[PDB]
Amino acid sequence: MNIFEMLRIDEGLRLKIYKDTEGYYTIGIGHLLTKSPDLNAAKSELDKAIGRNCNGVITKDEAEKLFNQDVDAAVRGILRNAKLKPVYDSLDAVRRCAAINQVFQMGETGVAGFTNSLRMLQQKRWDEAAVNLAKSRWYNQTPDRAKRVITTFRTGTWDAYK
Numbered sequence: 001m002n003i004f005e006m007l008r009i010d011e012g013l014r015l016k017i018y019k020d021t022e023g024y025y026t027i028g029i030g031h032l033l034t035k036s037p038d039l040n041a042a043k044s045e046l047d048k049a050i051g052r053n054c055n056g057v058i059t060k061d062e063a064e065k066l067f068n069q070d071v072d073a074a075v076r077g078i079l080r081n082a083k084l085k086p087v088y089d090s091l092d093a094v095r096r097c098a099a100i101n102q103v104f105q106m107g108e109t110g111v112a113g114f115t116n117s118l119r120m121l122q123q124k125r126w127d128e129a130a131v132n133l134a135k136s137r138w139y140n141q142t143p144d145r146a147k148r149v150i151t152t153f154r155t156g157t158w159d160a161y162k
């Protein structure tokens with residue numbers, strides 16, 4: 001297991017524009033195109049991201065290319081964030097994957113609501129952190145995925161991903 005395999009499980013792979021769990025146009029392995037309800041705006045974002053006229057469809061290679069860009073940018077964002085970097089750098093590599101996963105899903109603005117969880121994770125109070133993480137819109141809206149990510153934070157193992 002690694003961050004790519006982990007996010008591939010959690011996000012799936014779809015080659016045509018679809019709506020994510022929040023109703024937002026998306027493609028590939030959880031590549032958000034836009035929060036706009038306008039499908040045309042989404043198609044324009046897709047063409048911009050791929051560099052050709054896609055008419056709402058991409059190939060697996062193209063999906064994986066966006067995925068690599070998206071995972072990388074997520075990590076680099078964490079490292080630039082004064083609130084996130086110290087927590088991230090305190091963690092072992094398996095737990096760092098859980099961190100990347102959560103940021104990939106909800107963005108840094110999403111993880112801003114997790115200040116108390118962050119503190120417990122930095123303190124390595126793993127069961128306490130796991131309890132606090134589940135007290136969230138995140139958990140309630142995507143409980144099966146959040147359970148997997150939280151187990152990863154709690155144990156530092158890949159048990160939740162088989």
Ligand SMILES: Cc1ccc(Cl)cc1O
Nearest residue numbers: 084087088099102103111
């Ligand atoms: C919970 C959590 C901790 C540390 C980082 Cl870097 C991200 C997270 O989404």
